[PDB]
Design a protein around this nucleic acid. Structure first.
Ligand SMILES: [Cl-]
Ligand SMILES: [Mg+2]
Ligand SMILES: [Mg+2]
Ligand SMILES: [Mg+2]
Ligand SMILES: [Mg+2]
Ligand SMILES: [Mg+2]
Ligand SMILES: [Mg+2]
Ligand SMILES: [Mg+2]
Ligand SMILES: [Mg+2]
Ligand SMILES: [Mg+2]
Ligand SMILES: [Mg+2]
Ligand SMILES: [Zn+2]
Ligand SMILES: [Zn+2]
Lengths: 77, 244, 91, 135, 97, 41, 100
RNA sequence: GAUGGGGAAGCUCCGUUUCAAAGGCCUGAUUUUAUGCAGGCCACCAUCGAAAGGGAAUCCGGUUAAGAUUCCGGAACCUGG
RNA sequence: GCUUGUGACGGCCCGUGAAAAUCCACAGGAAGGAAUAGUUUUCAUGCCAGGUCGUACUGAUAACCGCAGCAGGUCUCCAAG
RNA sequence: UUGACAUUGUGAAGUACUUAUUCAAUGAAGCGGAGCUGGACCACGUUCUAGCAUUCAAGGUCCCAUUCGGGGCUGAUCCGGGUU
């Protein structure tokens, strides 16, 4: 129900000690007037709120997936 | 016969006053130390309509002499009183419209309204719109004051009784005809259940002393003595004279 | 263009209630719906609320007055009487 | 015939300081590059000292006599001039146009004004200036 | 006759009409006389007097409302206060007016 | 001396709120108190 | 042409039973019960609406922060700026007149 | 419609703040135990009376032979602590 | 365009068109408070709990009342071309 | 409705008093008498303005035994306990 546009605060949420699950959603959407691109959403399940980070660049998306904490339950699709 | 209409009103079941929308009882301040020795200043906050009353009302705020707060008083507004005006009440108040003074501290011919019959009853006389009391004499030795009432009667009142300088606002109301039954209906909708009225000669003998007969007529003199009992006092009670 | 000859504002009553009664209402209806000068701000912005209540559109001030006019003839006389008697007790 | 001088005491009429007494330090009648209107550089009181009686001990008197000052550029139309006056030579040099538009220089001026106000309040003079207006 | 004296200063002197412009002239010291309408609210009237006292300015109280003061100046709108910047060929400043 | 000031209050009519005074003459006593006093009178 | 019904037991059109028609993600029309609209706080002196104050039902003011319920000035959430200005001017002038 | 009071042989009647000594929440004082004792505050003085008046807070999707804004999944909000 | 909500206005009254619970702001300045240390749970995040009773169905030319599966009577919301 | 008796007492002369009884108000606040100050028997803190008025009250003075404060008188005249 809440959206974050900063990567630095996103990583802080993943180690908030109350976060246990997360999901990755891949969307195939069309841009303004170009070829289709893949859009990914990172959703962090907090105690009170769900935080969604959306990034449209697949190059930076791959790095963020790897950098996720190994102790966090991550659901792919 | 059965109980007649005017007898049934004393039970007060459907004949009580409709007081939901009333602003409150209109009274002067309680006679206190400041009133009887000096004066106290109040401020008019607003002038508002009161349901069932022709004359408008004024909300005046005074300070409490004995503790830190404000006190609200509901007065009957005189002509010329406006919002934001200072009101002075007491023995040493000035002779200005809206001020409350004892009847013994004003000159001859002064026009007053909301006059106390006795000191401290907080206003009994000259309350309807456009009415006033004329002060016509003083009796300093007997501490009395002679006044003229709206009905024309002359009354002797204590000089310590209070009154408000001026005439009750809203005058001239009764000069405009109601012009139809609908406006009469709404007038008494906010007063009491006394309208419309059925004539007694239109009823049956069981209902009214004027009822019955093969013609619609009274049949006996409509002047009824003061000594008659309930159920008989219908018509002109203790009339000294009749006719135009 | 003139729409009525003599009824004026009482044309809303049609032919009812009698000409004499309609004439009496016409005189008082014009007064109560009229616009009056304000003695506090000098503008022509005083109209009636309920009977006896007169409020100025500007300067947000309300004055108690007559049922259908701001000031009655009787109240004007009272002001003169109070003024005359006031000057006889202070000077 | 002009009373908007460098010692006149005025009352602020608007702007988070309404009802607070102030003294003019430097007036600018014919506008400036900014504030294209008549304005003055003023220093006033944000927290008036509390009333002190003879029952209060030495520890409590000092706490109750503290004064919180402020510096502000005010339009002439937002000031209400008075007849009182207060000398400004003790802190005239620190309150200026260069003092403003700089966060570091604002606080340095305010602590200078604080010392002057407290010493003025001691050995009671300009008592009307240190008395909070009731409204 | 104040009306005739006030008329002469209109066509030969410099005046100032309105509350805001009068206060601005008082702060600048260019005012020599202020005329206040009778129906001016007391709070505003007392404020003008306080400004006049600080600036050492003579005050005259007109015997009429804002409608009458506007007509005397020669305008079709109401005027609550008049500020005289400099008299022309009139002697309003040196007389009772 | 340089900090304390004298601010007398005005307790006249229309002035500051009246101070607390002894009102024993005006106390609305219980009924049994009044009866035993009025019996003496 | 889809028709809707009330979602509570009250079947009458009172002030507390007002509805709005919305379309759901399921693709159908459904009534939505709406609360009564709020009223702006008014000035204590002149009665006009106060600038800079949130408009909410009385109980909702306990949930919002104080910055939404006041203005950084004397009488912030009680009197408007013009009425506060009149109070200060009147207070100064009257007290000066008392001395003289 | 109780109480305080006044009626009535009595069943009961009047009246609702009334000719009444009408009641309790902030904490200080105590480290014997739990609340005696010290300034002040407040005097408003039962209770009943609306499934259409006033009113703190939830939505979508799915699910049964028959239940759902109540169950399931997901996503929120309020109050008290 | 239809239905409905809402805003700024205008007309009308000898008619001017509820109350209380409850929530908030301000005025006031009693106390409480820092330098090797304190305070704000009206900023954010995190923890726990939320009782009791109603909830099926008809709502009418057959589930209500008229002796009945009676052409009568019985309050209201949604409204396509 | 009118008269008589009871409630029903106190003083004077050819109406007077107070306590019974009756009416009214105030969360029973300033009553009665005297004494100061002023004026000529009366007054004895408040009238341009829609502000403000509350912490046994500041000040003065006398005590505690100094510590963060407490206690009298005065400020705010005495007398009678008849709420008016
Ligand atoms: Cl009848
Ligand atoms: Mg018949
Ligand atoms: Mg008969
Ligand atoms: Mg007969
Ligand atoms: Mg409801
Ligand atoms: Mg009963
Ligand atoms: Mg109940
Ligand atoms: Mg079902
Ligand atoms: Mg159901
Ligand atoms: Mg049956
Ligand atoms: Mg049956
Ligand atoms: Zn006006
Ligand atoms: Zn305002």
């Amino acid at each position: 129900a809440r959206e974050i546009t900063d990567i630095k605060q996103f990583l802080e949420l993943t180690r908030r000690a109350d976060v246990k699950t997360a999901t990755v959603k891949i969307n195939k959407k069309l841009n303004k007037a170009g070829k289709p691109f893949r859009q990914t959403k990172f959703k962090v399940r907090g105690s009170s709120s769900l935080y969604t980070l959306v990034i449209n660049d697949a190059g930076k998306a791959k790095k963020l997936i790897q950098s996720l904490p190994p102790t966090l339950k991550v659901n792919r699709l | 016969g059965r109980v007649i209409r005017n007898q049934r009103k004393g039970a007060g079941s459907i004949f009580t006053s409709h007081t939901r929308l009333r602003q409150g009882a209109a009274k002067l301040r309680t006679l206190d130390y400041a009133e009887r020795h000096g004066y106290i200043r109040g401020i008019v906050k607003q002038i508002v309509h009161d349901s069932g009353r022709g004359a408008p009302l004024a909300k005046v705020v005074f300070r409490d002499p004995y503790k830190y707060r404000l006190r609200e008083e509901i007065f009957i507004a005189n002509e010329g009183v406006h919002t934001g005006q200072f009101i002075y009440a007491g023995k040493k108040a000035s002779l200005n419209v809206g001020n409350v003074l004892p009847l013994g501290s004003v000159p001859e011919g002064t026009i007053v309204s909301n006059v106390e019959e006795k000191p401290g009853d907080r206003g009994a006389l000259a309350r309807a719109s456009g009415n006033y009391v004329i002060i016509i004499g003083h009796n300093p030795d007997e501490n009395k004051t002679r006044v003229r009432l709206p009905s024309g009667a002359k009354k002797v009142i204590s000089s310590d009784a209070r009154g408000v300088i001026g005439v009750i606002a809203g005058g001239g109301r009764v000069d405009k005809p109601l012009l139809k039954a609908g406006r009469a209906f709404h007038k008494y909708r906010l007063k009491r259940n006394s309208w419309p009225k059925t004539r007694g000669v239109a009823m049956n003998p069981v209902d009214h002393p004027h009822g019955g007969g093969n013609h619609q007529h009274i049949g006996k003199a409509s002047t009824i003595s003061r000594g008659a009992v309930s159920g008989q006092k219908a018509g002109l009670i203790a009339a000294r004279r009749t006719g135009l | 263009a003139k729409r009525t000859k003599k009824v004026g504002i009482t044309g809303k009553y049609g032919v009812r209630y009698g000409s004499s009664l309609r004439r009496q209402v016409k005189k008082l209806e014009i007064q109560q719906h009229a616009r009056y000068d304000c003695s506090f701000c000098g503008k022509k912005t005083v109209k009636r609320g309920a009977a006896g209540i007169w409020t100025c559109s500007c300067c947000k001030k309300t004055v108690a007055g007559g049922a259908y006019t701001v000031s009655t003839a009787a109240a004007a006389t009272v002001r003169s009487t109070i003024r005359r008697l006031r000057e006889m007790v202070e000077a | 015939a002009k009373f908007l001088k460098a010692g006149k005491v005025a009352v602020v009429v608007r702007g988070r300081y309404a009802g607070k007494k102030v003294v003019i330090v430097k007036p600018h009648d014919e506008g400036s590059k900014s504030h294209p209107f008549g304005h003055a550089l003023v220093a006033g009181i944000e927290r008036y000292p509390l009333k002190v009686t003879k029952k209060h001990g030495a520890k409590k008197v000092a706490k109750r006599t503290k004064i919180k000052p402020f510096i502000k550029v005010v339009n002439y139309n937002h000031l209400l001039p008075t007849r009182y006056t207060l000398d400004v030579e003790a802190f005239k040099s620190v309150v200026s146009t260069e003092t403003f538009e700089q966060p570091s220089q604002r606080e340095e001026a305010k602590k200078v004004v604080k010392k002057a106000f407290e010493e003025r309040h001691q050995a009671g003079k300009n008592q009307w200036f240190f008395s909070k207006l009731r409204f | 006759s104040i009306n005739q004296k006030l008329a002469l200063v209109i066509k030969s002197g410099k005046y100032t009409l309105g509350y805001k412009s009068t206060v601005k002239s008082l702060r600048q010291g260019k005012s020599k006389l202020i005329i206040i309408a009778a129906n001016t609210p007391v709070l505003r009237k007392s404020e003008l007097e306080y400004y006049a006292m600080l600036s050492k300015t003579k005050v005259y109280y007109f015997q009429g409302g804002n409608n009458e003061l506007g007509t005397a100046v020669g305008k079709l709108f109401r005027v609550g206060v008049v500020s005289i910047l400099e008299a022309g060929d009139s002697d309003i400043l040196t007389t009772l007016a | 001396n340089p900090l304390t000031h004298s601010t007398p209050k005005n307790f006249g009519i229309g002035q500051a709120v009246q101070p607390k005074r002894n009102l024993s003459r005006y106390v609305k006593w219980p009924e049994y108190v009044r009866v035993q006093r009025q019996k003496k009178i | 042409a889809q028709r809707v019904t009330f979602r509570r037991r009250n079947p009458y059109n009172t002030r507390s039973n007002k509805i709005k028609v919305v379309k759901t993600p399921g693709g159908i029309l459904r009534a939505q019960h709406v609360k009564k609209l709020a009223t702006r706080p008014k000035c204590g002196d002149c009665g006009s609406a106060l600038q800079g104050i949130s408009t909410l039902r009385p109980r909702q003011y306990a949930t919002v922060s104080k910055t939404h319920k006041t203005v950084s000035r004397a009488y912030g959430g009680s009197r408007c700026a013009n009425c506060v200005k009149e109070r200060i001017i009147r207070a100064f002038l009257i007290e000066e007149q008392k001395i003289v």
